[PDB]
Amino acid sequence: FINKRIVERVRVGQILAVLNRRFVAYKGKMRIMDITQSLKMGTKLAAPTV
Amino acid sequence: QVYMHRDMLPEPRLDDIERFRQEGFYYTNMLEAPPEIDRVVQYTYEIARL
């Protein structure tokens, strides 16, 4: 017994019911870049901060 | 004392060509005297950064 719907009996027209979930996908136009290695010491910013 | 200011190049009329026995309109950057302080905008690198 698992109390998790692993294998389930379905109708047919019900197949697509799975959909459900949200999902946000970055448009092809955009470029995802990790600014993680830009943490060198000798870099100063124009906006001083506290 | 070094400033920048949108300045026209003197384009004189030439009716009496002989009258150009004048100082041939020499023109210069050399200001006879500096600007009115309330008309000047003092820039520090600091501000320009921002």
Side-chain angles (χ1 to χ4, degrees):
Chain A
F1 177 68
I2 314 187
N3 189 15
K4 288 289 186 164
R5 285 178 177 188
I6 295 164
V7 185
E8 198 183 359
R9 88 151 55 190
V10 182
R11 294 305 172 262
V12 256
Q14 267 175 46
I15 280 180
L16 251 291
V18 215
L19 286 217
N20 185 333
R21 315 309 179 157
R22 154 220 184 125
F23 278 126
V24 247
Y26 287 79
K27 234 288 193 148
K29 302 207 173 198
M30 302 175 88
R31 294 280 147 95
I32 291 78
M33 288 154 215
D34 129 310
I35 302 197
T36 313
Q37 306 158 71
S38 11
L39 294 294
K40 131 101 184 211
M41 213 186 287
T43 332
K44 215 168 202 170
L45 48 263
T49 320
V50 202
Chain B
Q1 315 305 51
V2 193
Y3 312 68
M4 76 145 40
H5 174 196
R6 225 107 138 296
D7 262 276
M8 288 188 191
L9 232 270
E11 42 201 274
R13 282 188 124 269
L14 266 89
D15 303 85
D16 197 30
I17 304 173
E18 278 312 274
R19 209 262 149 142
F20 256 74
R21 172 196 102 229
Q22 255 261 76
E23 263 231 325
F25 254 103
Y26 71 130
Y27 180 85
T28 308
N29 309 112
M30 253 303 263
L31 299 180
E32 293 168 296
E36 300 169 35
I37 101 109
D38 57 79
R39 194 79 81 103
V40 171
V41 182
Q42 262 284 38
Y43 262 104
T44 332
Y45 275 72
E46 285 91 300
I47 334 166
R49 308 274 191 205
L50 288 157

